[PDB]
Amino acid sequence: MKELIYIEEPKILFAHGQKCTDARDGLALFGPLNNLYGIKSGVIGTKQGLKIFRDYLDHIQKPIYNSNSITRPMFPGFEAVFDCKWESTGITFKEVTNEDIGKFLYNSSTHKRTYDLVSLFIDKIISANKNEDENVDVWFVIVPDEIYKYCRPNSVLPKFHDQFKARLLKHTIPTQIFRESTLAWRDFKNAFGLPIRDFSKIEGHLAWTISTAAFYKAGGKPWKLSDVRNGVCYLGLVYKKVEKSKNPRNACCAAQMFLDNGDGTVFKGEVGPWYNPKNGQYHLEPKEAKALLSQSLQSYKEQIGEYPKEVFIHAKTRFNHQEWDAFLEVTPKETNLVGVTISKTKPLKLYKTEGDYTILRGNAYVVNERSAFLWTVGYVPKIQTALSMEVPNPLFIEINKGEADIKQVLKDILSLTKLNYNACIFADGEPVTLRFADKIGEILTASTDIKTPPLAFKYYI
Amino acid sequence: MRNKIFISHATPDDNDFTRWLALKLIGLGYEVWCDILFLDKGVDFWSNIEKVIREDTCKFLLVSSSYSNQREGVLKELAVAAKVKKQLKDDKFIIPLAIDEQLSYDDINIDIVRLNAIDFKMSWARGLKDILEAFEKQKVPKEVADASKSNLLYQQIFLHDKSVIEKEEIYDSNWLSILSFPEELRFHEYNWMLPKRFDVRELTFPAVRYKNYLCTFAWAYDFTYHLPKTETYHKSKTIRIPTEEILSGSYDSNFIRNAECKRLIVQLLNKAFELRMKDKEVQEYEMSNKTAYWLEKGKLEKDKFEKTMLVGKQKDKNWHFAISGASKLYPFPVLMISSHIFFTADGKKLIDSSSVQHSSRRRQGKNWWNNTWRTKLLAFIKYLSDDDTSFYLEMGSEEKVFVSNEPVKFKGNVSYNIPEKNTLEEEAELSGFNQGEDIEELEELIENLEAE
């Protein structure tokens, strides 16, 4: 017989300097943080793709009615809640002919087909930003629906995503990716009860995953955390195998959240080391460890200026002193360095007395000053359902090195979880530095060459 | 004064955005009163509407849709508004919010005189702007535009009456408590006695080899059948150290370490665990590294136990309930228990292809909930329980560690209430997301990350 504890849920900063809990409700009532008005987005596709995009734009201008607003809030129009205006016309786009986009589509190899798909996408994007300034700063690119059947299912006949997102970093040109099948929920159907997908039951959510996610790459910040202390860096890292050739090289990367002068957290992602020798260690040598922390230090200097106080380096694998010995000298004396490892190899499940309603999200089981158990997956009254389809499995957060505070690091994880821009869900199953860990790892392994500067997270995913 | 702008339409039928309109306009600095917003009952809604109209109101809003036609409420409220504007001499009183898509106009009324033809079918921003200069035309005494009171209202109507509340709940975990523990651990000196060139997994009693010291609780003479030459052994060579000092982190030297003695006992408990299951004669299935333990066809009454079904049937496939166990001694000397589901073609033979296996796993799991896991686990534990107090583990000739069958029970200080959405929650989430690269595409890959 033991005891557990609960931690108060953090808040997210919204428009007019106010904080709220719900994401869709918060945006639908106040709006994004900034105020941008002039957007003329573009689309890469064909005549049928153009018609699909125009029809979906008209639909999203129209009100979107869901099944139940209690479990998931609806979409109260786009302009009325975002304060950014498009029209049916007045979109600056450069589409492609049907034959050009369909010269070779039955190719089974993803590498060769994407080497031309990405080239076609970018060549029609980087060629329009030179005519007029800040005219095409946003794109809604839609890949053909045949990609949905010949890329992900690996060329089957039932009747990948970062590759045209990574090599565009050289031009510093963002884009937003969609699909006709994602938009044409009424098309390609039959006289069946549930043709293909038929998400008539869920329609407002599909209108929320398309607006807020595309808004962030318009130079505007939708929302940030309102309770982040000044002077903290995170600097996540990802280790996995690269799929170019043998000798995986154990590629690494970085992703750090930090505050600026005032009350605004920077949502930025940096690329550091290239690689390290041999195959299985999930660790880096001291010689390349100098640059990994030095780049973060210098970036913090030139866009903040003052010394930090606590940097909570996050990781998925176990740490070691082989890198800590190099890292301790790089950091200044006034700054404390703490290494934190979070894994998913602890299959713990809690059950209550009775009921189909499951555990909450936020309670913690403290053990000692080395690790803890935190349930980031469960039930919340706002969604009136369980975030998972089965019994939730909590995380395992441990402080490999440093002192910090368990009750304080747990609050950081909960706050850092609710920083999802690609979706507008109330919460996700992993912290953003780990939720997008795979995304960043795969976007980096697509373009290993060319050292990118300390550029913002706007341009990833 | 007259600054209470009013609205009344088909609220119980279609109210997908009435709350949004109200909150937006109050954030813009206005004042309303509705039927479904505040805590009120729809038994005197029209009487309350008439009472507030005759007391204090300035403008009116109506939303036109397909559901606001077949009811007498809309027409009676329209007639009331007509009478009120006739008495007050108002040529601009009500504003129709034409939101219907399939229907343009159905019933012609004299109410068109005091309103204007506005189309809200396409967009809402244009209509909101238009109603703003509608306010600005007559110089309405608009209040301050602040979202603080808008938020304060947001935690007063939309949900937030069912949020987390202080309530104690008892949570039973997967760990297994142990009450009886061995007094001392036997560190025998074998060296040449046991030659290293033999596997240890086939040994009847638990044993872990460490250089020359065999970390085991069994007697030195217990290992007679597997090794006949164990009779020649001096008792003093069996070095005994109490396990409580190791647990307390007090016994540490060059011979053994506190941080190193803990991990050797873990393998012993796991080995005793598969010994305990093979005592029960169940079927074995190695999935990746950790084995789930399940009971096969024709071994239990009605293919079930207590009051729940374990060996069930789904279409032409036989689904079973599997349990995988482990041991962890770091927080407490306790046992890890996990659950799994495996599928059999005929109840005896297993499919060598795991693709359809995890497909059926997800298919069966998307229709289960907390009870269909917790009750099944509890029944399985009770079936594995030997006595009525706590099942035991076999280690040797006299050693008997008793493990509490009752799971470790906690006390959650925070909980929530389920007034009437106990059944509504399961029906809404039956159809999950099964798309490709747009929402989730490495679901199978994440499931089978156990590639080594």
Domain A225-459 CATH class label: alpha beta
Answer positive or negative: Cα dihedral of B220, B226, B227, B231.
positive
Nearest to B373 among A67, A69, A391 (CB): A391
Do A382 and B338 make contact, defined as CB atoms within 8 angstroms? no
Q: Does A354 contact B at CB distance below 8 Å?
A: yes
**Neighbour count for residue B297 (Cβ, 10 Å):** 14
Cβ partners under 8 Å of residue B193, min gap 6 = B229, B230, B233
B202 in the same domain as B127: no
With beta carbons less than 8 A apart as the criterion, state whether A384 and A356 touch: no
Residue of B28, B144, B159, B367 to mutate when probing chain A, most A C-beta within 10 A: B159
Q: What burial class does residue A99 get, using C-beta atoms within 10 Å of its C-beta: 0-12 exposed, 13-18 middle, 19+ buried?
A: exposed
Strand partners, B439: none
Token readout for B195 is: 């030659």
- Please, how many CA atoms are within 13 Å of residue B149, restricted to the half-sphere of its CB? 13
- Please, how many CA atoms are within 13 Å of residue B15, restricted to the half-sphere of its CB? 16
Number of domains in chain B: 2
**Neighbour count for residue A289 (Cβ, 10 Å):** 23
CA-nearest residue to A154 within chain B is: B436
B265 in the same domain as B194: yes
Q: Are β-strands B94-98 and B60-64 bridged in parallel, bridged antiparallel, or unpaired?
A: parallel
Domains A34-216 and A225-459 are alike in CATH topology: no
Q: Are β-strands B165-178 and B400-415 bridged in parallel, bridged antiparallel, or unpaired?
A: antiparallel
Nearest to A363 among B331, B365, B414 (CB): B414
Which residues of chain B does A70 touch, with a Cβ-Cβ cutoff of 8 Å?
159
CA-nearest residue to B14 within chain A is: A65
Q: What burial class does residue B274 get, using C-beta atoms within 10 Å of its C-beta: 0-12 exposed, 13-18 middle, 19+ buried?
A: middle
Cβ partners under 8 Å of residue B393, min gap 6 = B269, B272, B273, B275, B276, B400, B401, B403
Do B170 and A353 make contact, defined as CB atoms within 8 angstroms? yes
Cβ partners under 8 Å of residue B286, min gap 6 = none
Token pair 């460490």 is found at B210
Token pair 């950081």 is found at A412
Q: Does A18 contact B at CB distance below 8 Å?
A: yes
CA distances from A249 to A244, A292, A355 (A): 10, 16, 49
Nearest to B436 among A29, A30, A148 (CB): A148
CA distances from B405 to B214, B321, B410 (A): 29, 19, 15
- Please, how many CA atoms are within 13 Å of residue B401, restricted to the half-sphere of its CB? 24
With beta carbons less than 8 A apart as the criterion, state whether A341 and A303 touch: no
With beta carbons less than 8 A apart as the criterion, state whether A187 and A57 touch: no
**End-to-end alpha carbon distance in chain B:** 76
Answer positive or negative: Cα dihedral of B412, B413, B418, B421.
negative
B245 in the same domain as B134: no
| Three-class DSSP labels, chain A | CCCCEECCCCCEECHHHCEECCHHHHHHHCCCCCCCCECCCECCCCHHHHHHHHHHHHHHHCCECCCCCCCCCCECCCHHHHCCECCCCCCCCCCCCHHHHCCCCCCCCHHHHHHHHHHHHHHCCCCCCCCCCCCCCCEEEEECCCHHHHCCCCCCCCCCCCHHHHHHHHCCCCCEEEEHHHHCCCCCCCCCCCCCCCCCCCCHHHHHHHHHHHHHCCCCCCCEECCCCCCEECCECCCECCCCCCCCCCECCCEEEEECCCCCEEEECCCCCCCCCCCCCCCCCHHHHHHHHHHHHHHHHHHCCCCCCEEEEEECCCCCHHHHHHHHHHCCCCCEEEEEEEECCCCCCCECCCCCCCCCCCEEEECCCCEEEECCCCEECCCCEECCCCCCCCEEEEEEECCCCHHHHHHHHHHHHCCCCCCCCCCCCCCHHHHCHHHHHHHHHHCCCCCCCCCEHHHCC
Q: Does A344 contact B at CB distance below 8 Å?
A: no
The backbone torsions φ and ψ at residue A385, rounded to the nearest 5 degrees and listed phi first, read: -165, 170
Between positions 139 and 178 of A, the ones with CB within 8 A of B are 148, 151-153, 160-161, 178
Measure the CA–CA gap between B335 and B332, rounded to whole angstroms: 9
- The distance of A29 to chain B (nearest Cα, Å) reads 6
Token pair 């499919």 is found at B351
B196 in the same domain as B119: no
- Quick one: how far is CA A89 from the chain centroid? 30
- Amino acid identity, position A271: V
Q: Does A16 contact B at CB distance below 8 Å?
A: yes
- Quick one: how far is CA A423 from the chain centroid? 8
The backbone torsions φ and ψ at residue A265, rounded to the nearest 5 degrees and listed phi first, read: -85, 140
Which residues of chain B does A78 touch, with a Cβ-Cβ cutoff of 8 Å?
125
Which residues of chain B does A350 touch, with a Cβ-Cβ cutoff of 8 Å?
171-173, 410
Q: Where are chain A's structural domains?
A: 34-216, 225-459
The backbone torsions φ and ψ at residue B154, rounded to the nearest 5 degrees and listed phi first, read: -65, -35
Q: What burial class does residue A364 get, using C-beta atoms within 10 Å of its C-beta: 0-12 exposed, 13-18 middle, 19+ buried?
A: buried
CA-nearest residue to A348 within chain B is: B174
Widest Cα–Cα separation across chain A: 70
B366: in domain: no
Nearest to B123 among A3, A79, A385 (CB): A79
B205 in the same domain as B128: no
Residue of A81, A359, A385, A391 to mutate when probing chain B, most B C-beta within 10 A: A391
Do B370 and A355 make contact, defined as CB atoms within 8 angstroms? yes
Strand partners, B7: B61
Between positions 310 and 329 of A, the ones with CB within 8 A of B are none
Left (φ > 0), alpha (ψ -120 to 50) or beta: where does A355 sit? left
Token pair 């904080």 is found at A19
- The distance of B177 to chain A (nearest Cα, Å) reads 9
Three-point CA angle B59, B63, B64, nearest 5°: 135
Nearest to A390 among B147, B365, B377 (CB): B365
Widest Cα–Cα separation across chain B: 117
Cβ partners under 8 Å of residue B107, min gap 6 = B69, B75
B200 in the same domain as B143: no
Nearest to B187 by CA among B254, B236, B259: B236
Do B437 and A161 make contact, defined as CB atoms within 8 angstroms? yes
Task: Return binding residues of B for NAD(+).
Answer: 8-9, 11, 35, 46, 71, 73, 77, 105, 115-117
CA distances from B146 to A29, A119, B90 (A): 12, 48, 30
Token pair 């949905």 is found at A148
CA distances from B94 to B3, B20, B27 (A): 14, 19, 21
The backbone torsions φ and ψ at residue A108, rounded to the nearest 5 degrees and listed phi first, read: -85, -25
Exposure b/e, A390-407, CB count within 10 A at least 16 = b: bbbbbbbbbbbbbebebe
Measure the CA–CA gap between A296 and A331, rounded to whole angstroms: 10
Strand partners, B357: none
| Three-class DSSP labels, chain B | CCCCCEECCCCCCCCCCHHHHHHHHHHCCCCCCCCCCCCCCCCCHHHHHHHHHHHCCCCEEEEECHHHCCCHHHHHHHHHHHHHHHHHCCCCCEEEEECCCCCCCCCCCHHHHHCCCCCCCCCCHHHHHHHHHHHHHCCCCCCCCCCHHHHHHHCCCCCCCCCCEEEEEEEEEEEEEECCCCCEEEEEECCCCCCCCCCCCCCCCCCEEECCEEEECCCCCCCCCCCHHHHCCCHHHCEEEEHHHHHCCCCCCCCCCHHHHHHHHHHHHHHHHHHHHHHHCCECCCCCCCCEEECCCCCCHHHEECCEECCEEECCEEEEEEEEEEEECCCCCEEEEEEEEEEECCCCCECCCCHHHHHHHHHHHCCCCCHHHHHHHHHHHHHHCCCCCEEEEECCCCCEEEEEEEEEEEEEEEECCCCCCCCHHHHHCCCCCCCCCCCCCCHHHHHCCCCC
**Neighbour count for residue A360 (Cβ, 10 Å):** 21
Three-point CA angle A444, A410, A331, nearest 5°: 60
CA-nearest residue to B163 within chain A is: A381
B199: in domain: yes
Measure the CA–CA gap between A330 and A425, rounded to whole angstroms: 38
Between positions 81 and 140 of A, the ones with CB within 8 A of B are 85
Answer positive or negative: Cα dihedral of B159, B165, B170, B175.
positive
B92: in domain: yes
- The distance of A297 to chain B (nearest Cα, Å) reads 34
Token readout for A352 is: 């209550």
Strand partners, B171: B410
- Quick one: how far is CA B356 from the chain centroid? 25
Measure the CA–CA gap between A365 and A6, rounded to whole angstroms: 8
Do A79 and B125 make contact, defined as CB atoms within 8 angstroms? yes
- The distance of A224 to chain B (nearest Cα, Å) reads 17
**Neighbour count for residue A385 (Cβ, 10 Å):** 21
**Neighbour count for residue A88 (Cβ, 10 Å):** 10
Do A352 and B370 make contact, defined as CB atoms within 8 angstroms? yes
B22: in domain: yes
Answer positive or negative: Cα dihedral of A175, A176, A179, A183.
negative
Boundary-marking domain end, from B240, B272, B304: B272
Nearest to B17 among A30, A74, A85 (CB): A74
**Neighbour count for residue B234 (Cβ, 10 Å):** 9
The backbone torsions φ and ψ at residue A102, rounded to the nearest 5 degrees and listed phi first, read: -120, 25
CATH number of A34-216: 3.40.50
Annotated ligand binding at A300? The verdict is no
- Quick one: how far is CA B401 from the chain centroid? 34
- Quick one: how far is CA A348 from the chain centroid? 27
CA distances from B394 to A90, A365, B179, B206, B269 (A): 79, 32, 15, 9, 10
Which residues of chain B does A16 touch, with a Cβ-Cβ cutoff of 8 Å?
146-147
Measure the CA–CA gap between B34 and B21, rounded to whole angstroms: 12
B149 in the same domain as B21: yes
B257: in domain: yes
Q: What burial class does residue B116 get, using C-beta atoms within 10 Å of its C-beta: 0-12 exposed, 13-18 middle, 19+ buried?
A: exposed
B233 in the same domain as B148: no
With beta carbons less than 8 A apart as the criterion, state whether A306 and A231 touch: yes
Do B436 and A360 make contact, defined as CB atoms within 8 angstroms? no
> Which value, in Å, is the radius of gyration of the alpha carbons in chain A?
23
CA distances from B109 to A5, B82, B114, B371 (A): 62, 10, 11, 56
Annotated ligand binding at A461? The verdict is yes
The backbone torsions φ and ψ at residue B424, rounded to the nearest 5 degrees and listed phi first, read: -65, -25
Do B441 and A30 make contact, defined as CB atoms within 8 angstroms? no
Do B123 and A179 make contact, defined as CB atoms within 8 angstroms? no
- Point out residues after which chain A has a gap (C–N over 2.5 Å): 159
Do B365 and A347 make contact, defined as CB atoms within 8 angstroms? no
Do B16 and A68 make contact, defined as CB atoms within 8 angstroms? no
Cβ partners under 8 Å of residue B131, min gap 6 = B95
- Amino acid identity, position B332: F
Measure the CA–CA gap between A25 and A17, rounded to whole angstroms: 16
Token readout for B51 is: 């009472």
With beta carbons less than 8 A apart as the criterion, state whether A136 and A42 touch: yes
Token readout for B46 is: 């029209």
Residue of A352, A379, A424, A461 to mutate when probing chain B, most B C-beta within 10 A: A352
Measure the CA–CA gap between B135 and B1, rounded to whole angstroms: 16
The backbone torsions φ and ψ at residue B392, rounded to the nearest 5 degrees and listed phi first, read: -110, 175
Measure the CA–CA gap between B232 and B195, rounded to whole angstroms: 15
**Neighbour count for residue A109 (Cβ, 10 Å):** 10
What is the extent of the structural domain holding B55? 6-154
With beta carbons less than 8 A apart as the criterion, state whether A167 and A447 touch: yes
Token readout for A167 is: 């090599």
B107: in domain: yes
CA distances from B219 to A392, B223, B275 (A): 43, 8, 17
CA distances from B157 to A22, A24, B48, B277, B280 (A): 14, 16, 19, 55, 57
- Please, how many CA atoms are within 13 Å of residue A400, restricted to the half-sphere of its CB? 19
Boundary-marking domain end, from B246, B272, B298: B272
Nearest to A62 among B122, B370, B412 (CB): B122
- Point out residues after which chain B has a gap (C–N over 2.5 Å): none
Token readout for A334 is: 């006034």
